[PDB]
Amino acid sequence: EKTRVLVVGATGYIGKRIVRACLAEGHETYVLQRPEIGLEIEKVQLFLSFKKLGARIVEGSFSDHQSLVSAVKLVDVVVSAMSGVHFRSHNILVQLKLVEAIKEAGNVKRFLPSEFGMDPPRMGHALPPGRETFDQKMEVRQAIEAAGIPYTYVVGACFAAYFAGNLSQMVTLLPPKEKVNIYGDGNVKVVFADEDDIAKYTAKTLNDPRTLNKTVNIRPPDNVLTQLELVQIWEKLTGKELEKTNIAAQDFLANIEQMEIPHQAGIGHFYHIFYEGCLTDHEVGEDEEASSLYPDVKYKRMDDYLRMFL
């Protein structure tokens, strides 16, 4: 009576956390080991570590359609943590080969595609090229709908390492030392979540009937913070006040067309989040929000998150 789960993208940044959260949760956890990563020592040893915790290795390749069909026939639920970084080479769209395999296999009770960010259907007017991420996720969503595959879309929170640990400064992954940039006036609400919590929520929700064919939002109330509130958390932890510089929207987007395309996409996403507030510009009900659905998850607050950087 354990739910059988296949994780595809098992050595990814969020993917490896989902693997471990599925194991802790008690799911019979299967991981797709692709032959193409056989010389990447950190991926190979990750898989060895998953085995020591009870994960079952499933060999398959996205170029071998029958291998993907065999893989998904072993489980009840599939979770994809496919990368989003190389949008111009359409790695989100690689998931379409998995959707086809799931359709042909017929047995999968639920599929969680690689979402875990902003809510794609709400991003219709996003800045290009950053817009491209949402199109591709939307194209995968439509592939899911057309095949009639039951689904859950996990959305709504900034990964804490990429937007809280650095006080949203972008240029590193650590808090700044003396000066900090405030984007806009810094009073736009942002949703931050420890990625291990996002992983726990994913493992709780993937066999929850309440979230069958639903969008689940990850919006822990204590972690809805403006950028200045985030900065003040850190200033209280350190005892030192940071010299602040406000950066107006127009100066943030200045000369964006001269940046490299990936940085252009990253700047666009940041703008929607921190200037327009896309993660908080709408309300969601407790019946579709993960912290209320799963109250036993004592999610990590941003003041406990930032302590590890002291």
Ligand X SMILES: NC(=O)C1=CN([C@@H]2O[C@H](COP(=O)(O)OP(=O)(O)OC[C@H]3O[C@@H](n4cnc5c(N)ncnc54)[C@H](OP(=O)(O)O)[C@@H]3O)[C@@H](O)[C@H]2O)C=CC1
Q: What residues form the annotated binding site?
A: 11, 13-14, 34, 43, 83-84, 88, 91, 114-115, 118, 137, 159, 170-171
Q: Are 95 and 113 in contact (CB under 8 A)?
A: yes
- Residue 194's nearest CA partner among 233, 160, 229, 225 is 160
Q: Which residue is catalytic, options 51, 97, 109, 137?
A: 137
Share of the chain residues as helix, strand and coil, in percent rounded to the nearest 5: 45, 15, 35
Residues binding its own copies: number (CB under 8 A): 18
Of 188 and 243, CB closest to ligand X: 188
Residue 215 interacts with ligand X (CB under 6 A)?
no
Residue 85 interacts with ligand X (CB under 6 A)?
yes
User: 9 touches which of its own copies, ligand X, none (CB within 5 to 8 A by kind)?
Assistant: ligand X
Residues 144-173 close enough to bind its own copies by CB under 8 A: 161-162, 171-173
Residue 45 interacts with its own copies (CB under 8 A)?
yes
Quick check: helix, strand or coil at residue 168?
A: coil
Q: Does residue 244 carry a catalytic annotation?
A: no
Selected from 24, 26, 51, 106, the binder of its own copies by CB under 8 A is 51
Distances (CA, A) of 208 to 28, 202, 266, 284: 16, 10, 33, 18
Residue type, 190: V
Residue 240 burial (10 A CB sphere; 0-12, 13-18, 19+): exposed
Residues 109-138 close enough to bind ligand X by CB under 6 A: 114, 116-117
- Residue 246's nearest CA partner among 272, 222, 268, 226 is 226
- List active site positions: 137
Where does this chain bind ligand X (CB under 6 A)?
9-15, 32, 34, 37, 43, 62, 81-85, 91, 94, 114, 116-117, 157-159, 162
